């Protein structure tokens, strides 16, 4: 009927606040679990297809229903921690109460997505406090939970201008702790996906806050060991900023150079891959600023004994656009690239990359015939620089007898 409907709805929300045990006692309460399962199941179908039911009083009743079900302390990690473990190889440990949890998530989402949903009426209840406890949940081990949370926080970000600043500051805090204190968190990817979409939304003359956020938060996310878990979405966030404002490219490329892995190969491949995507958007003007430091690295990589590092580097040559930026800058780039791939032409343990360095050397001479083997001319300038060095230290030490 036209009304006692609104009373019966609230009544059922109440009954869905009864938490059930799925872990400690896994065989208990089968019947009543189903009752709850059915109770919120129908409440989805109810609010989904019908309309004009998100009335003023049901708001607090819903938010409270969510909180009591969703906001718990996460249990101890089910995975070993330590330097000898790759979090990629962690056994998927699932949230045992997913029977109910899914439908609370699915519900609160439809509750959000309704075109009859009134933000500045709900905002009394979805507050900073709610957001913070929602943000805590991203460290859940269950990927399905993280998935829902991603979408939920993404909506909340969209529909509450009041909360946008807070949400930005809070996830920043989460990262800082991850990068600088613990180096463990299960939900880095998901938070970055939200952030990716957020980066696109940003406004024309990029605001200082966000520039800082790229340089101080997103770049250092690069230094943590478990980069593979969230690198794609991290790389995306970075690339988007560069599309939004090209003047950011020197600092970001200089940063990636600063953080270059010296003892972690998969990360070396990861960086090489990310940098190429960056070069795929580089305005020539911004390219001239970073070529030399960039290629002093590529030199190191090309001569790397690690076939996956060498390969990925050498694969830069199959990029028409990069290859042309090399071409009309050949003056500067070639004397630094040449020694590297020359030392590795005489011989190599790996035949494939042997093939690739022969090809690479070919493409360089076709750019500007450079019979410039005053390569060994530098190998002497360096012998002399070392003799001046050792003869300087002599003077300093024999001046220790001092005043």
């Amino acid at each position: 009927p036209p009304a006692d409907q609104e009373k019966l709805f609230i009544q059922k929300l109440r009954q869905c606040c009864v938490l059930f045990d799925f872990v400690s006692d896994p065989l208990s309460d089968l019947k009543w679990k189903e009752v709850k399962r059915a109770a919120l199941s129908e409440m989805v179908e109810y609010i989904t297809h019908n309309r004009n039911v998100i009335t003023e009083p049901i708001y607090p009743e819903v938010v409270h229903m969510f909180a009591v079900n969703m906001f718990r302390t996460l249990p101890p990690s089910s995975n070993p921690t330590g330097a000898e473990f790759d979090p990629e190889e962690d056994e998927p440990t699932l949230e045992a109460a997913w029977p109910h949890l899914q439908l609370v998530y699915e519900f609160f989402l439809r509750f959000l997505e309704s075109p009859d949903f009134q933000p500045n009426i709900a905002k009394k209840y979805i507050d900073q406090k709610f957001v913070l406890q929602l943000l805590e949940l991203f460290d859940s081990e269950d990927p399905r939970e993280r998935d829902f949370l991603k979408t939920t926080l993404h909506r909340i970000y969209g529909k509450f201008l009041g909360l946008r600043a807070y949400i930005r500051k809070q996830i920043n805090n989460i990262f800082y702790r991850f990068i600088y204190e613990t180096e463990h968190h299960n939900g880095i990817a998901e938070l970055l996906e939200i952030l990716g979409s957020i980066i696109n939304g940003f406004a024309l003359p990029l605001k200082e806050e966000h520039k800082i956020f790229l340089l101080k938060v997103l770049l250092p996310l690069h230094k943590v060991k478990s980069l593979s878990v969230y690198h794609p979405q991290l790389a995306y966030c970075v690339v988007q900023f560069l599309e939004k404002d090209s003047t950011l490219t020197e600092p970001v490329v200089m940063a990636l150079l600063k953080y270059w892995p010296k003892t972690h190969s998969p990360k070396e491949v990861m960086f090489l891959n990310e940098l190429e995507e960056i070069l795929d958007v580089i305005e020539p003007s911004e390219f001239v600023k970073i070529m030399e430091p960039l290629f002093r690295q590529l030199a190191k990589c090309v001569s790397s004994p690690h076939f996956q590092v060498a390969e990925r580097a050498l694969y830069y040559w199959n990029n028409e656009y990069i290859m042309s930026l090399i071409s009309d800058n050949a003056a500067k780039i070639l004397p630094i690239m040449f020694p590297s791939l020359y030392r590795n032409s005489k011989t190599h343990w790996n035949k494939t990359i042997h093939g690739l360095i022969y090809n690479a050397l070919k493409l360089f001479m076709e750019m500007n015939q450079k019979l410039f083997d005053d390569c060994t001319q530098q190998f002497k300038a360096e012998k002399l620089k070392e003799k001046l060095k050792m003869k300087e230290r002599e003077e300093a030490w024999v001046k220790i007898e001092n005043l």
Binding site: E84, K258, K262, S265, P305, F307, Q308, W349
Partner: protein, 303 residues
């Protein structure tokens, strides 16, 4: 007749038993000494009758220590290791260098074969290369060890009867003499008999078949039975495949898989095993669990 060097070796070994790496110039010297003894060993090494035979180890030093607790100390009991000393564990440097160490001090007491992880390529995609890098600061020790892996015999023959190898059988191989005729002094090729021997797996599909690993072949009972009958072998003993009981019979007992890394990569939860061949070549297996395992790291962009 001076044993100045065996004092030096005894020290290196003692050090290694305390899970402490040797130095760059010590590994280099060690490998140099190791090469000269391995080079004179056959593609199919003749191994004397009482031995204890072991599967994969993959850098799990503390479990190797555990192995010796079950098996006996590394001079008093003879050992034969079927390769795979270096990858997924946290202590590949200490493990391979210890095992090589033992071989040069006691060439007669220990034999070490090549596994599929003793190779430049495999050692780069899995831990060892990065381990060497964070423990030494350069790629030299890696260069010395990989150069040294080319010299490891491919297969062993215990008492003309128990054929020992890392992988399994090869379609290009029908006899031991086919094996003796190979040139092993090289990187493990992507195809061919040398490769199959380090890569293949037995299975339940009674014939040659495509390996789910990108290399070697699968092979069923009938190959094993022919291969054994043709060579007068009572058993093929092999070691490249995780088994949850640490050891596994198959092919009407023509082959055994032995696997010596308990709870592999500290993830897999498997038992480990080794097999003792006594004076009269009777066998017995010993299973064992992983040994009782009793700041913020340096940034990976440091060096």
């Amino acid at each position: 007749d001076e044993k100045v060097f065996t004092k030096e070796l005894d020290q290196w070994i003692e050090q290694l038993n305390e899970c402490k790496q040797l130095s760059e110039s010590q590994v280099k010297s060690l490998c140099e000494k190791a090469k000269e003894i391995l080079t004179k060993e056959s593609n199919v090494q003749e191994v004397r009758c009482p031995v204890t035979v072991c599967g994969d180890v993959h850098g799990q030093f503390h479990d190797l220590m555990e192995l010796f607790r079950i098996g006996g100390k590394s001079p008093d009991t003879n050992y034969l290791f079927m390769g795979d000393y270096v990858n997924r564990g946290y202590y590949s440097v200490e493990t391979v260098t210890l095992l090589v160490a033992l071989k040069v001090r006691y060439r007669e007491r220990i034999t070490i074969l090549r596994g599929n992880h003793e190779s430049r390529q495999i050692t780069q995609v899995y831990g060892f290369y990065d381990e060497c890098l964070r423990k030494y600061g350069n790629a030299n020790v890696w260069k010395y060890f990989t150069d040294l892996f080319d010299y490891l015999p491919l297969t062993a023959l215990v008492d003309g009867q128990i054929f020992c190898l890392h992988g399994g059988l090869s379609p290009s191989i029908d006899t031991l003499d086919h094996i003796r005729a190979l040139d092993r002094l090289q990187e493990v090729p992507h195809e061919g008999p040398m490769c199959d021997l380090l890569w293949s797996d037995p299975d339940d599909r009674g014939g040659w078949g495509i390996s789910p690993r990108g290399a070697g072949y699968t092979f069923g009972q009938d190959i094993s039975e022919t291969f054994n009958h043709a060579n007068g072998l009572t058993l093929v003993s092999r070691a490249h495949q995780l088994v949850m009981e640490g050891y596994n019979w198959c092919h009407d007992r023509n082959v055994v898989t032995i696997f010596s890394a308990p709870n592999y990569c500290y993830r897999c939860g498997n038992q480990a095993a080794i097999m003792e061949l006594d004076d009269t070549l009777k066998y017995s297996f010993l299973q064992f669990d992983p040994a009782p395992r009793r700041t913020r790291r340096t940034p990976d962009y440091f060096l």
